[PDB]
């Protein structure tokens, strides 16, 4: 198993959370995409 990790994966992981474009809920996706089975 070869793993390629970007040099800033640590700060990039926190950048996903720091924030909390068209939202997925408003895109042309089937109704099933937002209702779990």
């Amino acid at each position: 198993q070869i793993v390629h990790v970007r040099g800033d994966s640590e700060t990039d992981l926190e950048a996903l959370f720091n924030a909390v474009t068209v939202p997925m809920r408003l895109r042309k996706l089937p109704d099933s995409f937002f209702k779990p089975p």
Partner: protein, 206 residues
């Protein structure tokens, strides 16, 4: 049970889990997500242009791969992951079958805001079984980025915050014939947290 299947490769099983060893003879396994082998639901189509901005788009990105084809090898999986969990091993297992004997490469790209942050590359060899060829990725370790991401999501006080964070998180898995570069399967993964684990599978179309 042919759902995530092109004309050359069928993914029979895919699961990501946390296994805890209580003692040398006792193990507890929790599944975060699981696709496996009743009644096959019809796979609804999704216009792939609706997801291009959530995956890498440089040379060799999702659009270039889709345009190269074959179009029947592209899928979008929406998962509702089960994060209700407590000597630990975080792993991914998957199984594929093909009528052909090939050397396959499975590349998994973990993406943040549509950009690759981690790539895992695994090479798999065929085993003949019952007239076909079987390929198995057994207990492949989850990378540290994914393990720390699961931990950080679980520390959020509400599930809607986890879903908000997950809006910019995606995974792109590309399985290719190593000797021909043919795309055997290309699966885009999108996530929400389950309010057990559930999924819907879609065919990606132009």
């Amino acid at each position: 049970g042919r759902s995530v299947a092109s004309s050359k490769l069928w993914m029979l099983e895919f699961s990501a889990f946390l296994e805890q060893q209580q003692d040398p003879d006792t193990y507890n396994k929790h599944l975060f997500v699981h696709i496996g082998q009743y009644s096959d639901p019809y796979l609804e189509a999704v216009d792939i242009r609706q997801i291009y901005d959530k995956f890498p788009e440089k040379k060799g990105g999702l659009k270039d791969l889709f345009e190269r084809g074959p179009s029947n090898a592209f899928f979008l999986v929406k998962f509702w992951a089960d994060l209700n969990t407590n000597s630990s091993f975080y792993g991914v297992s998957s199984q594929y079958e093909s009528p052909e004997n090939m050397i396959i490469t499975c590349s998994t790209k973990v993406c943040s805001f549509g950009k690759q942050v981690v790539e895992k590359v695994e090479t798999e060899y065929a085993r003949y079984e019952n007239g076909h060829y079987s390929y198995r990725i057994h207990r492949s370790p989850l990378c540290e980025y994914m393990i720390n991401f699961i931990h950080k999501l679980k520390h959020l006080p509400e599930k809607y915050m986890m879903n908000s964070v997950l809006e910019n998180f995606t995974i792109l898995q590309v399985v290719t014939n190593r000797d021909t570069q043919e795309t055997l399967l290309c699966i885009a993964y999108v996530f929400e947290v389950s309010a057990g684990a559930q999924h819907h599978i879609y065919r990606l179309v132009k």
